Each structure stands twice: as structure tokens, then as C-alpha cells.
Design a protein around this ligand. Structure first.
Ligand SMILES: [Co+2]
Ligand SMILES: [Co+2]
Lengths: 467, 467
């Protein structure tokens, strides 16, 4: 068999955010709980021109003018690079992938292509070569049509104006929708695009998609086109593995527009929140485990209720990224690659400037060797200890989140404030990223220390005299 | 670390009270269950002109004309004075503080000031120098701008006309609301001020507050300004630690305007009760533990429900005070500093006249040495015993509350009735306060005795012949 990713994604249009930025985000989850991640800038000279994948052995000849981009490659390259997500020098963001679903009727017509492209590959072969989110969508579509794919995937694109979501369909087909400026999306591992207008300028797809549907009796609905009804799933597994994640996110942002059934199969794709959305909001949902419901594994529910649903924050979060393209700041500091590692319950995303040529050591240097000086291993260790007694550690966790995010914001604010006239912008921003990573490590380390100190007093292996 | 206070506060406007008085109140809670408190009048000659805090080392030069004021300082000065609350000779009341919440976005712009002011300090540096509640608000606002603060705090002020609530925002900013005459407030450890009209005569704030919000994308709402949405929190921890306290209080006073969800994040700040409010009402809510719900730790709920919410009456109540400025009595007896010590389940507030130069021995003289002749230690001992079998002791508790409060009221009524023509008002009221404290001790001691006598008969270590 082939190794597969898992994920939860959240998208925010430029009018829906609290600061007028676009946000595309994803929990990059995997099969094993731990799989070391690195934060790496791929400079143009480092980018392949003759690309061959490890998993599928697909060979793609690439353009000769790649742009510099951030990425989050695996430390261990057994299954290839797995760059996950990044922002290029044109301030275009891309995250790939959100594994989605398919069905036997479309697979019968356009099967997966064994030697096609996969999540292993997509950012590497698309992001360096596009100058808008729309261009990203179109290039990826072209590559799917030409080379095919062996996975069902959802991919996000953004620039300072637009946010797009592309879903792959069978071995070669695809469709994509531009998320409205004022909207957000929460997307689990299930095909998401619903109502789809072939006549809209805000949609793109395989030229033959409508004919594929119309000519092969793929449409289950009496009227109109709902792509996930046609090409996706509405399974019993969806009701426990996927829909509750969508539901919990929509309950958080749109409480008065969202009913009380986490199993709902027709939750809207495009949503409108009752307020503007912050980075902190996005990280909360990306770290969640159905808090204040009977489905919280750390909560008061029955054993069966507590384990019924797949949470969003999860032991096998490998990285979490929130890619932000800001507006009303100079373009050279618009791109922010927010990043953290390990189960999202005990980390914080750090707002790294994407306009840099290299990355901080604590985030760049993970290998297969356990190293608590590295933020991947330190963050995972913290979350594991936290998992053993969540209610005991959660107050320290909460304090740390506020304290750390406050410190990051102060550094960002100071750095933004002095951008004008900097003679070496990349060096200036690399220094800012170094400060951010240093503080992130210090506060992560201090949190773990506080947890170890208090936790040790509460060990089972104890016997105290109460005097 | 730095030690932090905790609290629950209740405010009542002059038209909302049963007697036309203003009331500002707070449970002064702390980290440890026990921390001995004293009732102390600071005469002008005792007041520092050159003040330095213990926790932050902030140094504040003070005016040379301080007014006399009541206060509730810590017996043990390890972390400074912690005066908590009092009434000055101009019949201005102040209670500080209700620790509240903040968020990373505003902290990123205006961080806490390490060597700034804190709860340790505020009553000492403000109350002696103001002649109205409004002046208190303005002086505190000025001091925050001058010295900064290292805590997020809520502070109440009152005189015979007005009640104000000030909340500190970041290291230097602040906002305050004059509570409508006919309104009340219940405030837990969460930022409270909601809808806020900068043009209102009922509001005061940092001169730059609206610009700070507008220019830095701090406002999450599509319309208007809600200060706690902007500057505060709505966290998962809020739903168990804070909101249920607000909810239980509002359920008590406004049953028909309050829904059934204790976790509600947008309970109103300003409320209107269905009736006029007594001192006895306020003490009840300040002593409460979600009686007649599954969230009552002394009740019938599951272990998880019983311990889910932070109660208002609690083991770490250090003092409880209700500062009352009465109307239509002569000004020399308008100020009443109601006071009790220890967990509020087994004490009663005593209506001490604030117009005095000294305080009764049973309330003034606590040290670190356990002394059951002192009301701090006696009250704490009583509440601890009560905690071991609440349903067994609650009838004696209830009887004592009625009996004791009736005795206090008789003494107050007689004292008020003979105020005219007194040649030495302070001596006259000090004598009344001595009578109050004497009877308060007698009734507290008799309660504990009755509990010990009946409790001893029900000890586990027993074996009786039933004849
Ligand atoms: Co070429
Ligand atoms: Co819209």
C-alpha cells in the first residue's frame, strides 16, 4: 500500500478576517503520531528542474524560473519531500493536501493513476511557478489533466486578494471555487464543494466536467449540480470522522446558523461568521477536541461518546500552518507563514515572515534523532505529557498560549514598525524570525518545565507525610 | 512567579437598592485558602508620601494631604499591604481588584509593565486623594498612564450618587462605565464591559482608546464597539470559571430575563433586577455555590458536574466586603464598611461604621499565629468544619445568619437613631462598632460550639448502645 496524509483545513476570505488579510490553513496530519518536520526556504537554485517523486515515480519537467518559497518538508525522506505548504516571493500561498473522498461511479470512469501526482509532490511542482491564487489553481489543474493523480485531494490557494479551493476528481479531473471575500470554510477529509455554477467566473474546472456528469448519469439530484453529491461521499464513516469537525468549526464561527447535529451530511461549504476572524480563532478550531460537548475525549462523556468522533487537534498533527497574506502593510512583509509542530493542544503558532532566505535553527534542524533542543521534538513531548492529565495541565497551557502569542505580537509589531528604509529586507526579517523562534523555544521549554515540576508532585509513585 | 488575586464582585446603583444606598462589593479571594486579614483605619499620619510596592517595586510619590480611610490589609506583608477596599472621609468607596482577562492582540500593542501598579497597590494610591467616585476613576486612569500596570483588573468606585466600574486594558489603557442608578452588575474574573458608547456621559476612557481600536484592527464586530469582545476573552475556561458565576447572580436577581445556559459568553454587563436589592441579597450571591443546580459541590450532582464550575463562596474567600454609602441619613453615618472573613458559607457581614479612627480588636488583630479569639481564624475554622458535612450543619448556619443579622440591624438602628448632637462622633461610632464586633464574635463562637457539639455526636469514631 501507499502512505496517506490526513488533515483539517480552514480558509478565510479577505473581508472575513479581523485584519483584512487572507488566511489559508491546515493541520498536516499523518499516519504515525510522530514524523519530524522541518521549516525550510527553497531558494531558486535549490529547486529541481527535473522532478521525480518517491512514492509514484512520476517524472515532471519543471519551468526554469522558480520563485523562492517557504515549505515544511519531512526530515526523513523515505516517502519523499512532503513540503505541505508555503508562501512564494510573489506572496502566493498554497497548502496541499486535505485528503477528501470520491465514489465508485466516477472512479469507474476515471480511475486513479498509479504513476500520477500526490500530496508528496503538489506544492513543489506548483507554488514556485505562479503569481496569483488563480494561476495556482489553473497550473495544478493542468498537471492533474496531464499526469493524473493517485489520491483524492483538496488544495487551498491564496494571494492578497483571493482565496481558492481546488478538489481533485478521479484520476484526471478537478474543480475549484473562489471563496467569497466575506466567507470562511472548514474542511475535513471529505469532498467539500457543494453547489457549483458552471456559468460563474468564480468557478474553474476540467473543460469536460459538465459533460462527464451529464453523459454518464452521475448526478443524483433532480435539479442543479452539487459536486460532492455527484463526486463525493455521504457515508456512515463521514458522520463520525468528518462532519463533526465541520460542525464544531461552524458552531464556533456561526453558532446561530448551525444546528445541533454533528453528523449532518449537508453542512454548507461556504459560511458566514457572526464576526471577523482572527489567527487566534483559526488556531483554536485547529486545536479543538469538541470542548464542552460529550464528544471531548478529555471531557466528562461516556467512553463511547468520548471516542466516537475524530478530533481536530490530534496526536498525529505533524505541523500546523496558517498562511497569511496581509493587506495595508508593505508587500515585503505581507506574507506570514504561521507555524507549529506536534499535537496542537500544547503548542502555539509563530508568525514567521515568509520573505526570508533561510529559517531559524530550532524550526529547521529536526532529524530522526530525538532532540529536545528542536521545536518539533519539544512540542510533541509537551503534548504527550499534557495528554496524560489534561485537566491538570490545561491552566498552565492556557497561560502559556496568551503569554507566548502576546510576545510574538509585540515582536511582529516592532518589526513591522521599522520596515521602512531597511537596506537588506531578508536579513532584517531573518533576524526577526530568529527572535520569534528563540522566544517560542524559551516559552515552550518553560511550559514543559512547569508541567514536569507540578506533574512530578502528583505522580502515582508518591507517599507524602502531610506535615 | 507573581502572586495573583481572585474575586467575585457585585455593584448596585442607588435606585436599585432597597434603601436608596449605593453598594459596591467584592469577595477578596486568594491563591491559598487561608491568608489572615485585618480591618484597619489608615489615619493621614500613617499614610506614606513615598510609596514602594513589594511585588513590582513601583515607586509612587503621593500628595501630602491624604484622607483617612478604612482598609483590609494582609496581616502577613510578604507580598505587600493588599488593602483591598475601603471608604474615605469624603464617603467615597473603592474596591480593588477584580482580576479580569485580556488578549494577545491588545497585549501586543500595549504590554504589561513589569514595574507598574497592581492590586497590591491601588486602594492605597487612589482612595485617600479623591472626593467622588468619578474622581477616583480619573485618578486611577492617570496613574495607569503614568506608571503602567502588570495586571488586568476591574475596580469599583462609589459615592452617595454614583457607582463606577473601571477596567484596565494592557499596560496603560482603561475604560470605565457609570452603572445606571436602577441597575446592578455581577462580575467574575473576566473582562466585563460590553457595548460602549464613547460619546456617553456615562463613560470615560483613555483619550486614545477609540483610535487604538480603529487603527489596529482590534474590533472583531461588524458594527459598534463591545469592549470585552475587543479587549477581553471568550475562552473555554471562561465557560466554567467565570460565566456561571455571572449567570447564577443574574438568575437570582433577573430570573425572567436570564436563560438556562451558565456557559453563555454574552451575558449582559448591566442588568435590571425584578426587585430592589438588599445587603442580605448581595451576601447571598457572594456566598453561593450554585444551590439547587447540579453544579452545587454540596449538592446531588455527579462528581464531574459538582466540580465543573468555580463557585462564588469558596474556601479561599479571604475577606468579603460590601461598601455602602447610605442616603437620607446624616453624612457622618452614611458610610458603612460591611465586613466578614473566611469562606462565606459560614460567616455574616457586619455593618461597621466607616467614620471611625480605629477598629475593633476581634477584626483588627490577626497575625500569622492561629488565634480563635480573632474573627479571621474563628470564621475560617467554622467554614472548614461546615464543609465536612454541609447538609448536616446548614440548618444551624441558616438560623445563625438570621439571628446575627437581626442583632446587627438592631444595633445599627439604635445607633442611627441617637446620632444627633453627639459631641464626639468617631468615639460614638467606634463604640457602636465594638458592640457589633462583640456580638458578631459571640454568635460566631456559639455557632461553632453548636456545630462541634452536634457534630461530635455524629463522628465516625463512635459506637453507641441504642438504649
Ligand atoms: Co526548460
Ligand atoms: Co458572502
Amino acid at each position: 500500500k501507499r502512505i496517506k496524509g490526513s488533515a483539517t483545513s480552514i480558509l478565510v476570505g479577505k473581508k472575513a478576517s479581523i485584519d483584512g488579510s487572507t488566511l489559508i490553513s491546515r493541520n498536516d496530519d499523518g499516519h504515525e503520531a510522530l514524523d519530524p518536520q522541518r521549516f525550510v526556504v527553497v531558494n531558486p537554485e535549490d529547486q529541481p528542474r527535473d522532478y521525480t517523486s518517491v512514492i509514484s515515480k512520476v517524472n515532471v519537467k519543471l519551468p526554469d524560473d522558480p520563485q523562492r518559497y517557504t515549505s515544511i518538508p519531512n526530515s526523513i525522506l523515505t516517502n519523499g519531500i512532503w513540503p505541505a505548504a508555503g508562501i512564494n516571493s510573489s506572496n502566493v500561498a498554497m497548502s496541499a493536501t486535505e485528503t477528501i473522498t470520491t465514489n465508485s461511479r466516477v472512479q469507474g470512469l476515471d480511475p486513479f493513476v498509479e504513476n500520477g501526482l500526490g500530496e508528496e509532490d503538489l506544492v513543489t511542482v506548483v507554488l514556485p511557478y505562479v503569481k496569483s491564487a488563480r494561476e495556482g489553481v489553473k497550473r495544478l489543474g493542468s498537471l492533474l489533466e496531464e499526469y493524473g493523480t493517485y489520491e483524492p485531494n483538496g488544495i487551498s490557494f491564496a494571494d492578497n486578494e483571493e482565496v481558492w479551493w481546488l478538489e481533485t476528481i478521479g484520476g484526471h479531473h478537478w474543480a475549484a471555487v473562489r471563496i467569497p471575500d466575506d466567507a470562511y470554510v472548514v474542511a475535513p477529509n471529505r469532498m467539500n464543494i457543494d453547489q457549483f455554477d458552471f456559468d460563474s467566473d468564480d468557478t474553474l474546472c476540467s473543460s469536460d466536467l459538465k459533460d462527464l456528469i451529464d453523459n454518464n448519469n452521475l448526478n443524483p439530484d433532480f435539479e442543479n449540480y452539487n459536486l460532492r453529491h455527484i463526486f463525493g461521499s455521504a457515508s456512515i464513516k463521514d458522520t463520525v470522522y468528518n462532519n463533526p469537525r465541520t460542525w464544531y468549526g461552524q458552531k464556533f464561527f456561526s453558532p446561530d446558523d448551525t444546528a445541533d447535529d454533528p453528523m449532518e451530511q449537508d453542512l454548507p461549504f461556504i459560511c458566514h461568521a457572526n464576526r471577523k476572524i482572527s489567527v487566534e480563532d483559526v488556531k483554536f478550531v485547529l486545536s479543538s477536541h469538541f470542548e464542552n460537548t460529550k464528544y471531548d475525549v478529555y471531557g466528562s462523556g461516556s467512553q463511547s461518546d468520548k471516542t466516537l468522533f475524530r478530533p481536530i487537534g490530534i496526536n498525529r498533527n505533524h505541523n500546523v500552518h496558517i498562511l497569511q497574506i496581509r493587506n495595508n502593510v508593505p508587500t515585503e512583509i505581507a506574507g506570514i507563514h504561521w507555524l507549529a509542530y506536534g499535537a496542537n493542544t500544547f503548542n502555539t503558532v509563530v508568525p514567521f515572515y515568509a520573505n526570508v532566505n533561510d529559517t531559524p535553527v530550532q524550526y529547521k534542524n529536526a532529524t530522526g534523532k530525538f532532540d529536545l533542543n528542536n521545536m518539533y521534538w519539544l512540542s510533541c513531548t509537551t503534548a504527550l505529557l499534557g495528554d496524560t492529565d489534561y485537566d491538570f495541565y490545561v491552566d498552565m497551557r492556557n497561560d502559556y498560549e496568551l503569554d507566548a502569542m502576546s510576545a510574538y505580537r509585540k515582536i511582529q509589531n516592532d518589526t513591522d514598525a521599522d520596515i521602512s528604509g531597511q537596506k537588506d529586507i531578508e536579513k532584517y526579517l531573518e533576524n526577526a524570525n530568529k527572535k520569534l523562534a528563540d522566544v517560542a523555544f524559551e516559552k515552550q521549554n518553560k511550559l514543559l518545565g512547569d508541567m514536569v515540576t507540578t506533574g512530578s508532585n502528583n505522580m502515582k509513585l508518591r507517599y507524602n507525610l502531610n506535615d
